[PDB]
Design a protein around this ligand. Structure first.
Ligand SMILES: Nc1nc2c(ncn2[C@@H]2O[C@H](COP(=O)(O)OP(=O)(O)OP(=O)(O)O)[C@@H](O)[C@H]2O)c(=O)[nH]1
Ligand SMILES: Nc1nc2c(ncn2[C@@H]2O[C@H](COP(=O)(O)OP(=O)(O)OP(=O)(O)O)[C@@H](O)[C@H]2O)c(=O)[nH]1
Ligand SMILES: Nc1nc2c(ncn2[C@@H]2O[C@H](COP(=O)(O)OP(=O)(O)O)[C@@H](O)[C@H]2O)c(=O)[nH]1
Ligand SMILES: Nc1nc2c(ncn2[C@@H]2O[C@H](COP(=O)(O)OP(=O)(O)O)[C@@H](O)[C@H]2O)c(=O)[nH]1
Ligand SMILES: [Mg+2]
Ligand SMILES: [Mg+2]
Lengths: 431, 440, 88, 430, 431
């Protein structure tokens, strides 16, 4: 009975959440109408973690979809598995920030942040025993990045003893959607360090590289990318919703992973990704999942984890599995390359086993990793941030809605602090 | 709700807009009488028509437009055309006599009477609209009306409607072909009004669209009617994100915040990637990677400037049709690597990608053939400074002998504010050089 | 082309003039739109089905969805199926 | 039963009533012969078997315009003995219609008023139709309204007076007759609504796009306002008002009883389809100075009180949201001593259009009657023109010959000046 | 067997009460003709409190209808459910007040008040045991505000041991329906503070916001507004007409909602309101009704309940519900919001349970609120009165009917005395 509040913000956040609630639905076996039609009794045992009871057996999600433009919300409402949401939970604005952090956080934020806390407070008070908040958004944008950093800021002041899972996508080196991606991410990262509790860094071309080499998809649309995002997010909550041999809540993963309060940027991956032409050749064994687990190619972050050391890693196995080959292989991967693991945190790898697998898969795993190799991303975003700020290009808006350049000078102050934090943590050694 | 007000000042604006409203009725299914027939295709009461049209009464749609020109001979052309019943008669604003290719007439003497009536219907359309997002201004700065009455309306709109974007599409005089002699005078003085009032300004030129229509559509004789037809596709694909849903919707304020690094440098080029005839379409294999290379060709821009002299500062690529997101990123990767185009050093991420889902339309009888995909590139560069520079040279040559000045002086204008636009334009020449200069 | 001045001035309007612009009747078909939604728009008070249950039973006779293009939109967005990782 | 009696004095009075009773017949379906093929009881009286007779009298000294009604298409409609004529007109002389030729003809006028009042059960009020510029309208109208105050007290009398303008003048002695009628209409009439000729001309050429309007085109849309403000008695509605509603919601002071008029959705047939006549669209257009039936600038003055008569498919919600935007608008100024300045009433019947009329069929309509301090500018314009013409005593020997005293010209001017002083003191902030 | 005499005055009173008898006749099961056609025995058990037995089994409402203009009576009679009323109760004038308080109370009222008390005394003598008089009218008008408030003085003189329930529609801040709203409201409130035992303050501006924001009705008529007002009136008499686990009649409410004799103005709100777009997603349960009845948006008065402390509150629950959830939810709203409730009265909330929910809903609640925040609407009308009274404008229509100017000063003094007592009890604290 540890429920999780879900909030979707931005174009990327709402599109991910639209696919996310499809993956939660068929795991618990509910139809697009809302009534239950699964064939397992264990699905209905824990539905308050993500859904709310309604009249006539209707199951309404704990989702608070919110955006400053109503265009993306129209697509999610009209789509399949989209009529399940409560229309009261679709808090929205009309003017739209339009890829501006200052508009999404200061001007257009003020008229909406009073309304979105009222919807969350109504939902959070109704449910009994809160565990955390699951927010999904982008960082390069302005509609969900600057607004999402505002909503996390107010929800920490209101519920300071509860978790926040922030599944956020980041700017990319290879291909960039918007010109103002370095400006919007640097301001957003400054608010995610002080406020958020766990941060799951996702990256677009890592999703594209997985869809090309592993899944062998010729034309990977955004739905193929968003199904990979929801593969992790279903696996994080798998112990709350389904019984298992090693039960691990959000707070279990939180206290096991972060040794210090600021170093809470993670990187995730889903293990059994095989192309349709290679299903019969592959054997679904425990060492096969682990070999794909620690591969850098399977990692959904742009940062190469060979360049850095894992401070702490988490694995969430699901399915009918033996605890022998689970933890022995975690011992085996630590002994194979001990140089890639932090020495002063002994026994880095933490594992949990859940009895009920995801739908269709015999067994699966979700791999959270708190590695210091993520500094290559924060250095890279700070590199493009200092490239434009010296010439003061694309700046006359942010200083127009009242966010001074002192907020920029403080931006790379903490942006370069946390990339200096991760570097010296890797260099330090015991004794 | 997303909606825009499209205004058309001068002879070039009406003819471009009449081709523009020709294309918009065909996409949304609006018949010339103003009524959508439900029995033509499957489809319900969507809000895609609400961007440019307003449902009035029951089953009648009127454009969110005004047509104004002092010359009566282009506004009665629409009054007796295929779209007489489409427009409400008040927003076809007429006048007694034209501006006679005199910027002083449009700004000061005759245009002062007509601009009061112009702001009334703009006020009425603003009360009809729920949430306004932009103004679309179609004027030609070479003529008396598009430069003169365009300057007065733009100044009054910025006072009454602050901070709302105005996407003004302007036609400049070509370095080679020109249809008037006082075009350097009108274009320079309109540059002052276009500078501090238009939020995002898109350039056009007759000769470059003449060159595109000559080679890409292999027809030797391009008329003004055929030139306006493919300008309307640029306007349609720019606004296509608001009407029809797509993978990456781009608002008008998203165009603004991503393409202009500094407030005064807002002069952008325009391109359309597939511009082909029916016979050449069969031999051509249209793919996202190929059209993106075709979008950045030096002959594909609609302004006769060479981008190799300058550097592409901020680029925006509006896609339409069956464009998957996987290969546009491959298209961005290929267009970034090759050296024949050059980016500015301080903008590592310069592309704005927008993918819509609605395929491009074709009007029957036009030269364009139906294509599955399209790219509408609107990109800022430092090669626009060459366009102002040649225009500056022709104005400075005609000002030393003081030719064609007494026409302006007698019609309200004073001698002092000819050089005021000359000084302001010269400040624009220096800004393109210092912004595009490298930083050490 | 024209054979006389009277014929040329009579057919100026319907060939190259103000009546030469393409008519939807002249077009073979109206393209099938990919709209945001055929349900009620999100912020539109003046709608016939605003108070009604448009997503479900109350709007069944009046929403007028388009199955082929709606399924094309869902397939392009990747919303229709979750069969990519089903493994069986 | 709601019953109202209308009196029409002069050439302008009965020509308006020709358009008024043409519209009233179409509202209740009354045919011109008087046969209907309970709501009709306000304007028509059932007589005999299936015959409806209008509750009005067409009195005029000039016989050349009364007999046109007696020989027109409404021959069987009106009672011919209700229509009162005379041998000769007043010839634009106020003294003739008040003392010499108006004295014997008003005795027959009060005879039929008593006959009409006894026939009706519950009388609501009086509707006078006259022009203060003409000799018969000002002269006989002053005598008729003076006798109606003492004979019929406590019944409010609506005043629809066609009022002169300095820009367009049809006669030379218009300033004399308008000034002399001002004393009578100040103390006798309970509610007076001014109407100006050239403002109706400007509404036709701007909204109805008619290049050459005529007097017939003016009286049809004048009758639209009159039928709209009386429509609450005839038919059911959401917020029904009465004759006695107007007399206290719009009159703050016993000498301040002058109000304007405005009919908002006056759109031709061709322009009606493109225009979306929303409630907020016409309410904004109603308070526009272009829609006023008198040439006024309401931004010069302040609105003391406003009445809004809403017809058609209007709910209580959108009439609230329309006038909420009106109060927030800066250009519409209300006087400081009246925070509650709006009176709104919603009817349930859309306006009926006359066949061959200029107006189009509209779903909803707004007729607005408002008390404003800007009406003093209308009264002050002919105050100066009268002063210039009286100073050289021109056009006086026609008046003093017909029994008039010369000393009452200054008495009318002092009473006109007392009207001006009352406006400038009520407009002054405290 | 505790009958209520229902009185409707003026245009507002006749129109609202026409929809009041729309609900009650449909609730008690009688047809447009008047014959009983209910499907339950419980409808016949207390049909006598609003209906009198007549020939042929037709039940006529115990309603007296009074105004000054026959147009509103023609609307009530010719409309649906209009053939049940007794034509002997169709007392009306001919002249019309014209929204004048003096004409409704002094000049015209003198020759019809003797007529209306003749029928009222006939209705009172016929029923065996009176329980109170329920009047519905407005305060901005003169036909129902003037003549109706006169009868409150005389019906209190003849029957001093019986209660007055005044559903009065007060003027709006943003809009004025009549130009003489503050003159008529301040004069009628002075006639209501002494004669009326309790008052039920209603207004249209809160009804507009309820229909838009909650019920999602973009184009509501008065019939939509009067339906919500009629839902309150049926809720007040719920325990009179039906058995319950804890009964509470009109004397039960007044002894708990009136701490001091002049503090008898209440604000009301009907709890289970939602649109069909959220009907399926809504989970109607006693916690869900509790968070809806206590919201400021649900209240049917212009006064914001957050600005002033709640003196006393009454809740009239209808439906088969647990009494524990009734008390603990009223307990939990007291402890979660302690600053919003008056400290010197412990247990501010009156709770009552009725076993018969209304037709179509299995659970309902009618909330009565006695709060000091209701001085805000009184202060606005008094402020509008003083602006008009200082210039003596719109007054010669009132003093011309035999009224002196000192009645206006005493009404204003009683108005200022009313808002003084509300402010003092809010400021005063025990110990
Ligand atoms: N692309 C395009 N350009 C046009 C078209 N018509 C006119 N132009 C351009 O407009 C210029 C003429 O100036 P205008 O502003 O149109 O002249 P005007 O609007 O009549 O103003 P006045 O001459 O003063 O009455 C020419 O140099 C053309 O380049 C057209 O149909 N298409
Ligand atoms: N609105 C309107 N005004 C009219 C009409 N006919 C005349 N008038 C006005 O009435 C004025 C003339 O005054 P009247 O009182 O009608 O003249 P009269 O009734 O013939 O009076 P005598 O000439 O003395 O007999 C003209 O200046 C017009 O402005 C009409 O049909 N409609
Ligand atoms: N995985 C995924 N990413 C998306 C989707 N839509 C947008 N994005 C990412 O979001 C980033 C841009 O964020 P943006 O839309 O500007 O955020 P917003 O301003 O809050 O709407 C791009 O880099 C895209 O890669 C989607 O459907 N799926
Ligand atoms: N709820 C509701 N209120 C009404 C209705 N009719 C009038 N009112 C209100 O009553 C007040 C004015 O009352 P009024 O009609 O002048 O009473 P009258 O003196 O009898 O004419 C205004 O605040 C209106 O909002 C109705 O049908 N329903
Ligand atoms: Mg011209
Ligand atoms: Mg005459």
């Amino acid at each position: 009975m540890r429920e999780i509040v879900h909030i979707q913000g931005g174009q990327c956040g709402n599109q991910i959440g639209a696919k996310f609630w499809e993956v939660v639905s068929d795991e618990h076996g509910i139809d697009p109408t809302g009534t239950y039609h699964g064939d397992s009794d264990l699905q209905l045992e824990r539905i308050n973690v993500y859904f709310n009871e309604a009249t006539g057996g209707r199951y309404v999600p704990r989702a608070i979809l919110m955006d400053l433009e109503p265009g993306t919300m129209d697509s999610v409402r009209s789509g399949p598995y989209g009529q399940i949401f409560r229309p009261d939970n679709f808090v929205f604005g009309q003017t739209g920030a339009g890829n501006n952090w200052a508009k999404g956080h200061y001007t257009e934020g003020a008229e909406l942040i009073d309304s979105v806390l009222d919807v969350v407070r109504k939902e959070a008070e109704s449910c009994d025993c809160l565990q955390g908040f699951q927010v999904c958004h982008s960082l390069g944008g302005g509609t969900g990045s600057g607004m999402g950093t505002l909503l996390i800021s107010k929800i920490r002041e209101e519920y300071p003893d509860r978790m926040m899972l922030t599944f956020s996508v980041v700017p990319s080196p290879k291909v960039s959607d918007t010109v103002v991606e370095p400006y919007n991410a640097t301001l957003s990262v400054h608010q995610l360090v002080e406020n958020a509790d766990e941060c799951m860094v996702l990256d677009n071309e890592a999703l594209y590289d997985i869809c090309f080499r592993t899944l062998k998809l010729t034309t990977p649309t955004f739905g193929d990318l968003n199904h990979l995002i929801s593969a992790v997010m279903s696996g994080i909550t798998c112990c709350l919703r389904f019984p298992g041999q090693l039960n691990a809540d959000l707070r279990k993963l939180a206290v096991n992973l972060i040794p210090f309060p600021r170093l809470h940027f993670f990187m995730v991956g889903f293990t059994p990704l095989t192309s349709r032409g290679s299903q019969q050749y592959r054997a679904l064994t425990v060492p096969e999942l682990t070999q794909q687990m620690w591969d850098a190619k399977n990692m959904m972050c742009a940062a190469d984890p060979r360049h850095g050391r894992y401070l702490t890693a988490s694995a969430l196995f699901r399915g009918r599995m033996s605890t022998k080959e689970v933890d022995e292989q975690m011992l085996n991967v630590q002994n194979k390359n001990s140089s890639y693991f932090v020495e002063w945190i002994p026994n880095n790898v933490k594992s949990s086993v859940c009895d009920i697998p995801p739908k269709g898969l015999k067994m699966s795993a979700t791999f959270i990793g708190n590695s210091t190799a993520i500094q290559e991303m924060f250095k890279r975003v700070s590199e493009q941030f200092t490239a434009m700020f010296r010439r003061k290009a694309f700046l006359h808006w942010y200083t127009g809605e009242g966010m001074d350049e002192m907020e920029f000078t403080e931006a790379e102050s903490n942006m370069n602090d946390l990339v200096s934090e991760y570097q010296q943590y890797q260099d330090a050694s015991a004794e | 709700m997303r909606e825009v007000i499209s205004i058309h000042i001068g002879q070039a604006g009406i003819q471009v807009g009449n081709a523009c409203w020709e294309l918009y009725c065909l996409e949304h299914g609006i018949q010339p009488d103003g009524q959508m027939p439900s029995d033509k295709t499957i489809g319900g009461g969507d809000d895609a028509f609400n961007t440019f049209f307003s449902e009035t009464g029951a089953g009648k749609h009127v454009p969110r437009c005004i047509f104004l020109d002092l010359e009566p001979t282009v506004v009665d052309e629409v009054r007796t055309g295929t779209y007489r019943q489409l427009f409400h008669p008040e927003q076809l604003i007429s006048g007694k006599e034209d501006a006679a290719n005199n910027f002083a007439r449009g700004h000061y003497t005759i245009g002062k009477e007509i601009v009061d009536l112009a702001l009334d219907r703009i006020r009425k359309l603003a009360d009809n609209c729920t949430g306004l997002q932009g103004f679309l201004v179609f004027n030609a700065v070479g003529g008396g009306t598009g430069s003169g009455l365009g300057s007065l309306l733009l100044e009054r709109l910025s006072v009454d409607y602050g901070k709302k974007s105005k996407l003004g599409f302007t036609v400049y005089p070509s370095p080679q072909v020109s249809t008037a002699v006082v075009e350097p005078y009108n274009s320079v003085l309109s540059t002052h009004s276009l500078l501090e009032h238009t939020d995002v300004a898109v350039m056009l030129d007759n000769e470059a669209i003449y060159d595109i229509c000559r080679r890409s559509l292999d027809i030797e004789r391009p008329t003004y009617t055929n030139l306006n037809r493919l300008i309307a596709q640029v306007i349609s694909s720019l606004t296509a994100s608001l009407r029809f849903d797509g993978a990456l919707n781009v608002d008008i304020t998203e165009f603004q915040t991503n393409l202009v690094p500094y407030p005064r440098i807002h002069f952008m080029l325009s391109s359309y990637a597939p511009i082909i005839s029916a016979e050449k379409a069969y031999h051509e294999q249209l793919s996202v990677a190929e059209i993106t290379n075709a979008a950045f060709e030096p002959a594909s821009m609609m302004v006769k400037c060479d981008p190799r002299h300058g550097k592409y500062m901020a680029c925006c690529l509006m896609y339409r049709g069956d464009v998957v997101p996987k290969d546009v990123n491959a298209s961005v990767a290929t267009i970034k690597t090759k050296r024949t185009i050059q980016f500015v050093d301080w903008c590592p991420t310069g592309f704005k990608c927008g993918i819509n889902y609605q395929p491009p339309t074709v009007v029957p009888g036009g030269d364009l053939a139906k294509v599955q995909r399209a790219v509408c590139m609107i990109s800022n560069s430092t090669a626009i400074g060459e366009i102002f520079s040649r225009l500056d040279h022709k104005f400075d040559l005609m000002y030393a002998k003081r030719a064609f000045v007494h026409w302006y002086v007698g019609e309200g204008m004073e001698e002092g504010e000819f050089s005021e636009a000359r000084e302001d334009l010269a400040a624009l020449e220096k800004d393109f050089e210092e912004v595009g200069a490298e930083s050490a | 082309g024209p054979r006389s001045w009277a014929e040329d001035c009579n057919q100026y309007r319907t060939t190259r003039g103000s009546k030469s612009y393409s008519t939807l009747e002249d077009a073979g078909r109206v393209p099938e739109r990919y709209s945001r939604t055929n349900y009620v728009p999100f912020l539109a008070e003046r709608h016939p089905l605003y108070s009604y249950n448009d997503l479900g039973e109350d709007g069944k006779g009046k929403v007028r969805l388009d199955p082929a293009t709606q399924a094309d939109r869902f397939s392009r967005h990747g919303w229709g199926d979750v069969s990519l990782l089903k493994q069986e």
